[PDB]
From Swiss-Prot, chain A:
Name this protein carries in UniProt: Pre-mRNA-splicing factor 6
Note: Present with 2250 molecules/cell in log phase SD medium.
Subunit details: Component of the U4/U6-U5 tri-snRNP complex composed of the U4, U6 and U5 snRNAs and at least PRP3, PRP4, PRP6, PRP8, PRP18, PRP31, PRP38, SNU13, SNU23, SNU66, SNU114, SPP381, SMB1, SMD1, SMD2, SMD3, SMX2, SMX3, LSM2, LSM3, LSM4, LSM5, LSM6, LSM7, LSM8, BRR2 and DIB1.
Full-length numbering of the shown residues: 4 to 150 of 899
Name of the coding gene: PRP6
Cell location: Nucleus
Signal sequence, start to end: none
Function (record text): Participates in pre-mRNA splicing. Part of the U4/U5/U6 tri-snRNP complex, one of the building blocks of the spliceosome.
UniProtKB/Swiss-Prot annotation, chain B:
Protein name, as recorded: Pre-mRNA-splicing factor 8
Subunit structure: Component of the U4/U6-U5 tri-snRNP complex composed of the U4, U6 and U5 snRNAs and at least PRP3, PRP4, PRP6, PRP8, PRP18, PRP31, PRP38, SNU13, SNU23, SNU66, SNU114, SPP381, SMB1, SMD1, SMD2, SMD3, SMX2, SMX3, LSM2, LSM3, LSM4, LSM5, LSM6, LSM7, LSM8, BRR2 and DIB1.
Additional remark text: Present with 468 molecules/cell in log phase SD medium.
Origin: domain of life: Eukaryota
Domain free text: The MPN (JAB/Mov34) domain has structural similarity with deubiquitinating enzymes, but lacks the residues that would bind the catalytic metal ion. Contains a region with structural similarity to reverse transcriptase, presenting the classical thumb, fingers and palm architecture, but lacks enzyme activity, since the essential metal-binding residues are not conserved.
Organism expressing this protein natively: Saccharomyces cerevisiae (strain ATCC 204508 / S288c) (Baker's yeast)
Annotated stretches, region: Important for branch point selection: 40-48
Compartments, as annotated in UniProt: Nucleus
From Swiss-Prot, chain C:
Membrane-crossing segments per the record: none
Identification of the protein by name: Pre-mRNA-processing factor 31
Any further remark recorded for this protein: Present with 1260 molecules/cell in log phase SD medium.
Part of the whole protein covered: 354 to 462 of 494
Oligomeric and partner information: Component of the U4/U6-U5 tri-snRNP complex composed of the U4, U6 and U5 snRNAs and at least PRP3, PRP4, PRP6, PRP8, PRP18, PRP31, PRP38, SNU13, SNU23, SNU66, SNU114, SPP381, SMB1, SMD1, SMD2, SMD3, SMX2, SMX3, LSM2, LSM3, LSM4, LSM5, LSM6, LSM7, LSM8, BRR2 and DIB1.
Domain of life: Eukaryota
Subcellular location(s) per record: Nucleus
Purpose: Promotes the association of the U4/U6.U5 tri-snRNP particle with pre-spliceosomes to form the mature spliceosomal complex.
Swiss-Prot record, chain D:
GO BP of this protein: mRNA splicing, via spliceosome
SMART domains in UniProt: DIM1
Source species, domain of life: Eukaryota
Described purpose of this protein according to its UniProt entry: Essential role in pre-mRNA splicing. Also essential for entry into mitosis (G2/M progression) as well as for chromosome segregation during mitosis.
Nucleus is among the record's keywords: yes
Subunit structure: Component of the U4/U6-U5 tri-snRNP complex composed of the U4, U6 and U5 snRNAs and at least PRP3, PRP4, PRP6, PRP8, PRP18, PRP31, PRP38, SNU13, SNU23, SNU66, SNU114, SPP381, SMB1, SMD1, SMD2, SMD3, SMX2, SMX3, LSM2, LSM3, LSM4, LSM5, LSM6, LSM7, LSM8, BRR2 and DIB1.
Record lineage: Eukaryota, Fungi, Dikarya, Ascomycota, Saccharomycotina
Pfam families: DIM1 (PF02966)
Organism per entry: Saccharomyces cerevisiae (strain ATCC 204508 / S288c)
Compartments (UniProt record): Nucleus
Key words, A-Z: Acetylation, mRNA processing, mRNA splicing, Nucleus
Name recorded for this polypeptide: Spliceosomal protein DIB1
Isomerase is among the record's keywords: no
SUPFAM superfamilies found in the cross-reference section: Thioredoxin-like
Gene coding for it: DIB1
Amino acid sequence: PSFLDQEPPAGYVPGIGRGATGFKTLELKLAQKKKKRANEKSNVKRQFADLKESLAAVTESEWMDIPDATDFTRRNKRNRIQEQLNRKTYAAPD
Amino acid sequence: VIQALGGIETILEHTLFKGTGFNSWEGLFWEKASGFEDSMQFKKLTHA
Amino acid sequence: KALPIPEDQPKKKRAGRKFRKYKEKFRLSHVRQLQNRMEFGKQEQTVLDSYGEEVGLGMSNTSLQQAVGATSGSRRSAGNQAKLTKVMKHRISEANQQADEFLISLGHN
Amino acid sequence: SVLLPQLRTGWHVDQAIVTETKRLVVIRFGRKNDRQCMIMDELLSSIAERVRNFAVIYLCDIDEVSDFDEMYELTDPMTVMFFYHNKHMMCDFGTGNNNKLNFIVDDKQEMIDILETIFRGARKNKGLVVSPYDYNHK
Amino acid sequence: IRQKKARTILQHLSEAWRCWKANIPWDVPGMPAPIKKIIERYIKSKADAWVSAAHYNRERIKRGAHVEKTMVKKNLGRLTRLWIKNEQERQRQIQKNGPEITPEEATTIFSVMVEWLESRSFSPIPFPPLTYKNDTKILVLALEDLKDVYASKVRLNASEREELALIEEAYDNPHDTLNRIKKYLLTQRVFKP
RNA sequence: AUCCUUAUGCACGGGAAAUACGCAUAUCAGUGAGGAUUCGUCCGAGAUUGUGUUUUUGCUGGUUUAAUUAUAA
């Protein structure tokens, strides 16, 4: 995705860029009836706030030095054994 | 059920079967699709 | 692992003798076709499954054999007769002999 | 999400759509504060690597670059669109709008059958792919 | 530093969530205590949500308020997972707290039978003799009853054709297979999961 | 000098399987891999982990007519 690394624009409008194909006064008083209209008028985060805070003491070495992950359930092994054992079928003898 | 539907012909009038223009149907066999389908399952096929 | 690519391939067709016997397994028998053919206009033969639910065997008996209920001997393919996996095979045979020497220890005593 | 790369420019867009040679291009148009534009973002998040051979996935907020809105007629929070060799791929879902996509697909396996099915269709040049699944009632 | 580590952090969100799907206690060293705590609390939340959701859907499926579809499917899984969890629990605590009969009760019970049978004049079942007139006239019965799952099937999957193999061999070389049985009875006390 | 034996190699004939086989600078492994039981013992070489193919490897099989040119004027 180098053009995600480059990310220049050019002077060009996107549409032709590919050759693309499609296959104040009244608004003023309108705003008056808008702000007028509204004139008559989380918990989760709050929970974890303590712990996400208590991480304040965590050294960035431990951030650097941390395991990444593993597989405890052996998802691969059993998995590939399934999608192995089912590979083929057969015909039921006559 | 057949008779109470008016006998075979009155059914087949509901079909294309005249289209294949066999004179009378009395010699013919169908082809279960399940056979064709299965016979295509022993191959190697994406879930789609 | 990435799903390979959807695109179909030109079929390699190699049919030896050997390779054929290895095919006869996966390809429907003859009989197994004479099921599928449903005689038009006339109710199937069906049988009752384990569950009593009816398995149609449609033409598997030539209509002369329906009148007499002759079932079929016709052709029985020995090609697709199911056979053990490698591993399981030796667990079977192995356990058999082992049990047999245990037995013969009840043979002489 | 982190797997899914994103677009910041209409320039990114049309370069991408041009610059993926051999495989499908998938783009979500949706606004981060949308509900589905989270959900669907997840569904696609789980399929990214698994399809990476024959297609590729990108996220684009209308709010980021709203250019295409006029030209592709973007309503709804989330519309996925599929492009292969710069052509707009059209797979009738029976939903009544054959172009593009709207709603939420709830099955991985489904979604894959779509990305695939369309792909295989687009490799032959057929403009119409006919979905495996008519979800129309949506 | 963030982004690279951020991803993996997401992983242990997953492998957390799985390892709770599995009951596995899920311990890693090098995982700083506070984070691990965080994960815990998280899994409690998503957990309770997931469970309550499962039971919630369920009863609806019994009444029939439109469930969509994938809820009908996944529901069975995301549920049976539990029923296993409950079972594993009841048996944990039938290790810890030991059997619930207490011997006194058992004496009455066992007595009851023993009296019954004596009263009934009943001889126990002999272990089958190595020559038992009915052996063949039996095996066939039992063998057919492993046969008839299949008698419809057109396409044997893998595990099947393995069985149907055995059923045919023992159905062929009986005297051997009988011997294999009788041994299994007389000894084997261990079994495959 | 002849034979047998053993293993290995080149072969020839014949059968069998192709849910089998690989591969791996992996990791361990007679300094015990793994298993069993009649609970005294007995057995004693691969297992793990990842990975690739596996309705297959190579090949070979049958159906959807050239240019040159001749009259007496």
